[PDB]
Amino acid sequence: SKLQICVEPTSQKLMPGSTLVLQCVAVGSPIPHYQWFKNELPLTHETKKLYMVPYVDLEHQGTYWCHVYNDRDSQDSKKVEIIID
Structure with missing residues (x-):
């Protein structure tokens, strides 16, 4: 089944001490792998x-x-900016 990113990460404006949470979720078979940059x-x-x-x-x-990938297909998530103010 087609590798496809379904949950895209979100940009955030954070303060020092806050939590950074980025998420990317894909479907596909073979099961997608992930690597953050x-x-x-x-x-x-x-x-x-x-x-x-x-x-x-x-x-x-x-x-x-x-980067989301398997042994046939790969997609990059959207690029998101984390700003720390």
């Missing part, structure tokens, strides 16, 4: 539908997206 670099070990940072600071500001 920030500022063009993979976030190590962030291979889940959720990416969550409990207490944010300025270092978490940036542009994020998730």
